[PDB]
Amino acid sequence: LANVVPCSQWDELARVLVTLFDSRHLLYQLLWNMFSKEVELADSMQTLFRGNSLASKIMTFCFKVYGATYLQKLLDPLSLEENQRNLLQMTEKFFHAIISSSSEFPPQLRSVCHCLYQVVSQRFPQNSIGAVGSAMFLRFINPAIVSPYEAPRIERGLKLMSKILQSIANHHMRPFNDFVKSNFDAARRFFLDIAS
Numbered sequence: 001l002a003n004v005v006p007c008s009q010w011d012e013l014a015r016v017l018v019t020l021f022d023s024r025h026l027l028y029q030l031l032w033n034m035f036s037k038e039v040e041l042a043d044s045m046q047t048l049f050r051g052n053s054l055a056s057k058i059m060t061f062c063f064k065v066y067g068a069t070y071l072q073k074l075l076d077p078l079s080l081e082e083n084q085r086n087l088l089q090m091t092e093k094f095f096h097a098i099i100s101s102s103s104e105f106p107p108q109l110r111s112v113c114h115c116l117y118q119v120v121s122q123r124f125p126q127n128s129i130g131a132v133g134s135a136m137f138l139r140f141i142n143p144a145i146v147s148p149y150e151a152p153r154i155e156r157g158l159k160l161m162s163k164i165l166q167s168i169a170n171h172h173m174r175p176f177n178d179f180v181k182s183n184f185d186a187a188r189r190f191f192l193d194i195a196s
Contacts, residue, residue, distance in 0.1 A: 002034070002054045014057045019065070031115040034058070039123055045131050063140055066109055071150055074101055078151035080172050088179060091161045095183070098141070102193035110194050117195035133191045134169045142166055 005013055021030040038048060038055040049056040077097065080087075113132065121128040142162045146155050163173060168180050169187060 007052075010054055010057055014054065014061050018058055018062050028111045028115065031112060032119060035116065035119055039120065045124060045127070048131060049135065060139065062112060063109075063136075066112075067140060070106070070109070071144070073104065075144075075150040084176070087157065087161065087176070090157065091164060091179070094161075099187070099190045102190045105194050113194045129188070129191045129195055130169075130171070132195070133187065134166075137165060137169050 001013060001017075017030075017034075021027055034055065038053075042048065043050070049059060074097065077093070113136075116132055117129055120132065142165055144150075145158045145162045145165070160173075164176065164180065167177070168183065171184065
């Protein structure tokens, strides 16, 4: 079905292939299959699933439907030299919530990342979660930071710290890297909890 349907209507297929086999007990086994094709192309271990094709459209929909109940508790809380001390408090207030959100991760969403981790590790012995972590950030946390949907200077402040969030997982803003090296590898312990 993937390569025969015109791209003008891929939304229906992206919806159905996920929303059907999830309930028919193939959900775990399902993602092991179509996610293989984007791996062989690779384009280094940095540009996986990048583009408008039928491997990230399904990914951008699975966590979009499944993430409705997850953000209920996570998003419940709510010359750049003078304004430098006050900046770190929001990042400190949110980073530990992100780290501890691994405990609250549902088992149903654990399998989605477990599949990706095992499939990537089958071919990528190194890390295999750094790209996964960076992608889940830039897809679900970093863009959702400035979202006016769930809880004009607050937007700018949150957008700025989104860059730090990107940089820490990715391994005037340059001096602000002092806090980046504070938890360079602490995030990987939170990363591996789901993929364990």
